[PDB]
Design a protein that fits this description.
By secondary structure, the protein is an alpha/beta fold. The protein has helices at 32-42, 51-56, 89-92, 104-110, and strands at 8-16, 20-22, 46-50, 68-72, 84-86, 97-100, 116-122, 133-134, 143-146, 150-151, 157-164. The chain is globular, with a radius of gyration of 15 Å. The protein binds NADP nicotinamide-adenine-dinucleotide phosphate and the ligand Cc1nc(N)nc(N)c1OCCCOc1cc(Cl)c(Cl)cc1Cl. The PDB classes it as oxidoreductase.
Length: 166
């Protein structure tokens, strides 16, 4: 689908219905089904994340295996074992296929160049709070399909959105 000479940038995130994606340096829910979905989409590709999202990774999956981990930071001395640290978006988006995996700052940074968004919506009524990380706002040029609601093992329900644009 992707010509190897092109640079497909995709965004992937899970959000509460309110748009909350992050809180207190963590994701305020657990959804193994979403983790699986995220793994399915990003596997074998370059992934790009903000430094704070690197900090948020569970140790057992830091770095995320099977993927080239790229971390954006302005700290030249930042230690990110198993990952590479770059100081600019330009040097982070050199692969034919890149998935930007968070957080709020880097979604907003990469969004203008993105042509794919893979969104998990979790039906949890977490209101937006001060200091929360929020999902980026998509313009009208995006289009795609909304999947049906599904119960997770835990009884938490979620659904998948696949957006794209030219
Ligand atoms: N629900 C989800 O799908 C999901 C996914 C990922 C993350 N999250 C959540 O999102 C939250 C973190 O998001 P966030 O917005 O606070 O932080 P973030 O986007 O993960 O990281 C921001 C950091 O990235 C670096 N950075 C940002 N813009 C840059 C630029 N233009 N050039 C170079 N470096 C740059 C800076 O690092 P330095 O400060 O080191 O310079 C900055 O502090 C956490 O709560 C996390 O759990 C949620
Ligand atoms: C979890 C997730 N889900 C989706 N659909 N997209 C993401 N970017 C995403 O975040 C990837 C970076 C954070 O990765 C994790 C964070 C936590 Cl708190 C846990 Cl328990 C697991 C993972 Cl992989």
């Amino acid at each position: 689908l992707v010509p190897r000479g092109s640079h497909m940038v995709g965004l992937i995130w899970a959000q509460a219905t309110s748009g909350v994606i992050g809180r207190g340096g963590d994701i305020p829910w657990r959804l193994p089904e979403d983790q699986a979905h995220f793994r399915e989409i990003t596997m074998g590709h370059t992934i790009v994340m903000g430094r704070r999202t690197w900090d948020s990774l569970p140790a057992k999956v830091r770095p995320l295996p099977g993927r080239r981990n790229v971390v954006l930071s302005r700290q030249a001395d930042f230690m990110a074992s198993g990952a590479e640290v770059v100081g600019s978006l330009e040097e982070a988006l050199t692969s034919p296929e890149t998935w930007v995996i968070g957080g709020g700052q880097v979604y907003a940074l990469a969004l203008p160049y993105a042509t794919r968004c893979e969104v998990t919506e979790v039906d949890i009524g977490l209101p937006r709070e001060a200091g929360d990380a929020l999902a980026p706002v998509l313009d009208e040029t995006w289009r795609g399909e909304t999947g049906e609601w599904r119960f997770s093992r835990s009884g938490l329900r979620y659904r998948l959105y696949s957006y794209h644009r030219s």
